[PDB]
Structure 1
Amino acid sequence: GFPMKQGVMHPTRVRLLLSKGHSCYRPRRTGERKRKSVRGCIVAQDLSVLALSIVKQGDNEIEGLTDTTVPKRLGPKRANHIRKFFGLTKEDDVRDFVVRREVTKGDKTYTKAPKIQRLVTPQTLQRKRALKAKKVKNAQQQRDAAAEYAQLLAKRLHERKEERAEI
């Protein structure tokens, strides 16, 4: 039952220190590594199963693989994924082409539609306006504060000039 792993140049089992990212291991804690037994990538007679993917269909069909189809489970959800799925240009309202699966409950059947990410609304533009407005306003207040400090420094400087010119 030990899985085959890419890169292990062996027809036999090896023992590897697996970390985040390696196949055949799902880490349970951040930074955790385990040493696990895996099977090499070279196919030999000691294998219980051999996973295969059809690359080309030659002359005949197959009982439940080549003669049938299964639909995809979900459709696009990000805005530009929908646009590239239907070839839509950057003018069409993406909201009215969203796939909507049908859910039944007794008789009050209805549709479930994916929420779209990265979709521009008045709220998003409102936030983009607000951030820049805050930056500019902040710069104005900082310039005012520096100007006031300069005026205070100048007043002290000149009153000091005349105060030491009295003595």
Structure 2
Amino acid sequence: FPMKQGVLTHGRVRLLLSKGHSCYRPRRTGERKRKSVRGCIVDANLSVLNLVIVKKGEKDIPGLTDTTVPRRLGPKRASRIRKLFNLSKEDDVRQYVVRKPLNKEGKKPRTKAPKIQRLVTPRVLQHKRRRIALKKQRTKKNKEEAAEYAKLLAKRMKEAKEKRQEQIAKRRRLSSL
């Protein structure tokens, strides 16, 4: 059973663990489950204790220091390319993204670059033009409809005012009967 942070005791406990907690992975959205974990403070009675070397000693160790393992994937966000290879906002990112070589048994040697997201392409700029063109279309439609309804309501209220003026003049001449 794994060790997890902040339990702060010596023995083994049982916790309800959820999304965002460690030593647990949910299956359904919203699932919580009593799993049994081990506290922070340590003793002999465990198999594996994990260590992270945080300051290199003055002498080498062969298993850990001599060989080096590079990062496997190059960066993919455009500003992360910028802040890796130290770019401004004018130099082209796409020639500066890392590409990998490809060599195996019986196949052609290749190279492979990630499809970098968040670069500014003319399709993104076209969509940003399209939404504000659509906005001005919507205000033009709104002012057009409002003006033609204003003309129509002026005409209908002119009709109703002339109708009641007909009533008042007709019953004045009926009073003159």
Corresponding residue for residue 157 of structure 1? 157
Secondary structure of the structure 2 residue equivalent to 1:66 = helix
Corresponding residue for residue 173 of structure 2? none
Matched ranges for 1:1-167 at <5 A: 2-104=1-103, 106-167=106-167
Output the TM-score relative to the length of structure 1.
Answer: 0.94
> 1:20-77 deviations in whole A, cap 9, x for unaligned?
1111000011100110110111011111111001111223211211222110000110
Give the aligned length.
166
Secondary structure of the structure 1 residue equivalent to 2:13 = strand
Deviates more, 1:59-68 or 1:94-103: 59-68
Deviation (angstroms), 1:137: 0.5
d(CA) in 2 for partners of 1:135, 1:150: 23
> 1:108-155 deviations in whole A, cap 9, x for unaligned?
211110011011111111110000011111111111111111111111
Structure 1, gaps ≥5 residues long: none
Output the TM-score relative to the length of structure 2.
Answer: 0.89
Structure 2, gaps ≥5 residues long: 168-177
Deviation (angstroms), 1:107: 4.7
d(CA) in 2 for partners of 1:59, 1:163: 105
d(CA) in 1 for partners of 2:52, 2:28: 33
Deviates more, 1:52-61 or 1:105-114: 105-114
| RMSD of aligned residue pairs (Cα, Å) | 1.2
Greater CA radius of gyration, 1 or 2? 2
